[PDB]
Amino acid sequence: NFLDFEQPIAELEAKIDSLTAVSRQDEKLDINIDEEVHRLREKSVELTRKIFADLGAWQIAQLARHPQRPYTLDYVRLAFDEFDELAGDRAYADDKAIVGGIARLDGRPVMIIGHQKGRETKEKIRRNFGMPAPEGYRKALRLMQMAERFKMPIITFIDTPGAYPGVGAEERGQSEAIARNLREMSRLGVPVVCTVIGEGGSGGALAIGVGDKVNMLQYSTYSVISPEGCASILWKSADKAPLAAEAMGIIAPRLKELKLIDSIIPEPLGGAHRNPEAMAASLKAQLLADLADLDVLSTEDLKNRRYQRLMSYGYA
Amino acid sequence: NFLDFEQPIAELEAKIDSLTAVSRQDEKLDINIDEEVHRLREKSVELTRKIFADLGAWQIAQLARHPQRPYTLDYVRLAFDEFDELAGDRAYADDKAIVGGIARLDGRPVMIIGHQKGRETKEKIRRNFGMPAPEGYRKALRLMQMAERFKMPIITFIDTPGAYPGVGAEERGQSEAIARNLREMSRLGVPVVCTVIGEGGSGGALAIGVGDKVNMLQYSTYSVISPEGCASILWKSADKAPLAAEAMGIIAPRLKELKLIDSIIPEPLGGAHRNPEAMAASLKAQLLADLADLDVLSTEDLKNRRYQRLMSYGYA
Amino acid sequence: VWTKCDSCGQVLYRAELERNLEVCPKCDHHMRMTARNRLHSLLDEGSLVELGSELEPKDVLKFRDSKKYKDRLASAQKETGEKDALVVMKGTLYGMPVVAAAFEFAFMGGSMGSVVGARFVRAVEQALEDNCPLICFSASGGARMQEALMSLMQMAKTSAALAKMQERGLPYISVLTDPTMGGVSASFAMLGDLNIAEPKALIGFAGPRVIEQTVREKLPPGFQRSEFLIEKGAIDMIVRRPEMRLKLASILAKLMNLPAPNP
Numbered sequence A, B: 001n002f003l004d005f006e007q008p009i010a011e012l013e014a015k016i017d018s019l020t021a022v023s024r025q026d027e028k029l030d031i032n033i034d035e036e037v038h039r040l041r042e043k044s045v046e047l048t049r050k051i052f053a054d055l056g057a058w059q060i061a062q063l064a065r066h067p068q069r070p071y072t073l074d075y076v077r078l079a080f081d082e083f084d085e086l087a088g089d090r091a092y093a094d095d096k097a098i099v100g101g102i103a104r105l106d107g108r109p110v111m112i113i114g115h116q117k118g119r120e121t122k123e124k125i126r127r128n129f130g131m132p133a134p135e136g137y138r139k140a141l142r143l144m145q146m147a148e149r150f151k152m153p154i155i156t157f158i159d160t161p162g163a164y165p166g167v168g169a170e171e172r173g174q175s176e177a178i179a180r181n182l183r184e185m186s187r188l189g190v191p192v193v194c195t196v197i198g199e200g201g202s203g204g205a206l207a208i209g210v211g212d213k214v215n216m217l218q219y220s221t222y223s224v225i226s227p228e229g230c231a232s233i234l235w236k237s238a239d240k241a242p243l244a245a246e247a248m249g250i251i252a253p254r255l256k257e258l259k260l261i262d263s264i265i266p267e268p269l270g271g272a273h274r275n276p277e278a279m280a281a282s283l284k285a286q287l288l289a290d291l292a293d294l295d296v297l298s299t300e301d302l303k304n305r306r307y308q309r310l311m312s313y314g315y316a
Numbered sequence C: 001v002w003t004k005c006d007s008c009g010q011v012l013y014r015a016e017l018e019r020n021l022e023v024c025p026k027c028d029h030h031m032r033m034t035a036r037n038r039l040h041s042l043l044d045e046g047s048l049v050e051l052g053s054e055l056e057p058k059d060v061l062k063f064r065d066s067k068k069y070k071d072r073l074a075s076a077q078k079e080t081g082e083k084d085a086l087v088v089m090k091g092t093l094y095g096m097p098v099v100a101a102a103f104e105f106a107f108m109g110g111s112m113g114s115v116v117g118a119r120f121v122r123a124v125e126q127a128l129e130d131n132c133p134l135i136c137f138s139a140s141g142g143a144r145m146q147e148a149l150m151s152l153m154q155m156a157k158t159s160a161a162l163a164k165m166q167e168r169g170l171p172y173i174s175v176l177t178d179p180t181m182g183g184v185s186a187s188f189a190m191l192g193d194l195n196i197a198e199p200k201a202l203i204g205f206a207g208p209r210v211i212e213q214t215v216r217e218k219l220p221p222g223f224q225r226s227e228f229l230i231e232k233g234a235i236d237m238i239v240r241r242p243e244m245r246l247k248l249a250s251i252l253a254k255l256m257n258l259p260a261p262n263p
């Protein structure tokens, strides 16, 4: 299910699929079919390259919400091994919108926390579309504290519409959970590396995104409020969302020039959904580089550097 | 509403009340009425002295459950000043079965946590008859941590049937709350003084009773299970409760010789309910004495002494 | 040599069940496993070394409900072959030093008394002096009623010991078998870094009967079971017994930062 502006590319891909089936249905015409497949493959590559050459902030925001994209579990599967999933905040319930656990990054033991939206329409409603209740932020805090106990670095995948604005979630103190996470994550004695794969923001994403290195994929957004909400409250309309997306500056390079994130992880041509394996490899390389240059610092120096980086946010 | 075995005393007291009313209804016969009142007052004093001379363990257990007895709020009112009540565990709800706050003991700032059963039949059901859900033990832990932060000694009043065995309270991890309280209360860097006023036990009382000095009133009980439950499981009957109470050894003098509590606070003649003010004064004196000899120890020495006292429990 | 699984009423071959770690090969029902057999299965072969073996029940209260508590202790010791409920054994796990402790539910319902707490503290101290993870399998009906507060306090004691371990940074895994209730689930069984629980294990604080009496209603289906609790957040994960050993090794290989075990 590609996006609207990707309608041409999808058609070509569909065509390729058809030709592939034909190439698997006969044998005496393989040469011409294969040549046409190669020609149309080159056509698709060039079309994707030129279409993506100039994408607006709204187009990028749509890409970050593409209903075909690697989520936290996909990156865990394609870039980590020996992943044990820990469930429960020990108090009320385990939120399926946040998945956490302990795995190995190239043999090193790491702790992984991240939002999980869900693939199909069943998991999407099972996981509240990636919107975690407070008993998910409390689980995230518990796992982060566990990792910090056993001299273990932490890796966070930030892909969520935001915190769930439900009556139950509001009764159980969402604000308290988020605030406690923000306060405690600034004192962890282990290096924290955060990435903003997919869509994140509204402050229910910063609850697991106060790290030493903040990274963002090329086609990912990070905003204080979704463009729909910003348009509704300020532009007094919902159809003026793209104006709000352009004005806020929610695209990765725009946030980069403000000194708000550390680096942008280049994506495969045509978005991370086309080649998830390449995206996972790039993300793994970036994570290894960030841990490589974060291990040199002592724990006290690491915490001091994190505090200074936090206090350097904003123009004031 | 006195106990069954206290029926004579109650009758005498009623008589005294009547005589008082008569003394407040006429003036020409005041001398004889006052003389009779004094004589019957001496009679009541001697009768209470002789009745209480030999009380069985079941009688003591009934006294600890007397439906007229100072609860945590009563001791706070009659022995502490400037009490600010802190409510909420920050997660789910505030349990009315446990009341906590910060007040002043003879000017010194102290933290007070304790079970509150409630006076009448309305408050008893409002406060779940002193049985706290896990969100009460979590509030107790929060307040104890707050006190330990601001170099503040802690005072605990243990008066409860036990932890609430409800479906809702069980879903929210009662065991986790109790276990976390027990683990964290052994590391507090402030002296903890615990008293077992009223009825306590079943392990939902030890959750706020792991202290440096454990005290118990004369007519208070502290058992691993209520005598009814012990009889039911072991004696196969509920009418053999007094046998279970006698066999367990739940009375204060019996526990003292086992090296399980530090001292017994003598009560006013006829139980703490007759003269709550004298009981409050005695408890306040005991608390001041216990804090006086606990301040001398350094924090590290205080914690080491607490750890050794814990490890010295049991015959093994 | 032909046993029957009471949950499904099959005719399981006895040695077939024994080689499967007392798990029904048909319905996968987790049945009783003795402490010594469990610890032999978990830890490596030829490295077991029991700890706290000099501690024996030494009743002081002189309890007597319907049978002499000394007679109860003698009968249980003869029946099970263990001095008291908990059994502590040092050993190796895939080449990794580790101290394990296993309850023996046949001994007076696996109730926790003075000897149980003393043995647990010995296990914690051994783990501390020789830095290594601690694994505890819990199967208990609660706190030993025949010792009163002298048993209740064993909660606090054990908790304190675990606190010490947590201060040293040593991992501690708490496997929750069937059942784990009373003062064992409220002191150290649910106080682990990871609360692993076996499938369909009755875990809680107050037993179902007393909850029914107090609430006077119908308990939710599958109440207090492991599958019901994992959704309530009390259980970190649910691990089948035949896969437990390996799983535990892997976990403690990542918590301790040691190289992964050789499968």
Ligand SMILES: CC(=O)SCCNC(=O)CCNC(=O)[C@H](O)C(C)(C)COP(=O)(O)OP(=O)(O)OC[C@H]1O[C@@H](n2cnc3c(N)ncnc32)[C@H](O)[C@@H]1OP(=O)(O)O
Residues within 6 Å of the ligand: B202, B224, B225, B233, C108, C109, C110, C111, C140, C141, C142, C143, C144, C145, C146, C179, C180, C181, C182, C183, C202, C205, C206, C207, C208, C209, C210
């Ligand atoms: C307040 C406390 O901490 S002790 C209160 C008792 N325990 C509880 O309330 C929690 C759970 N309650 C229970 O009855 C059980 O533990 C349950 C619900 C798990 C049921 O498990 P069951 O298969 O029924 O085991 P059962 O209770 O029969 O235990 C086996 C034996 O251990 C005994 N036992 C178990 N726990 C205890 C205990 N705390 N004190 C003394 N004996 C005990 C039982 O009397 C029984 O002896 P018997 O078979 O010779 O009569």
Ligand SMILES: [Zn+2]
Residues within 6 Å of the ligand: C005, C006, C007, C008, C009, C010, C024, C025, C026, C027, C028, C029
């Ligand atoms: Zn079966």
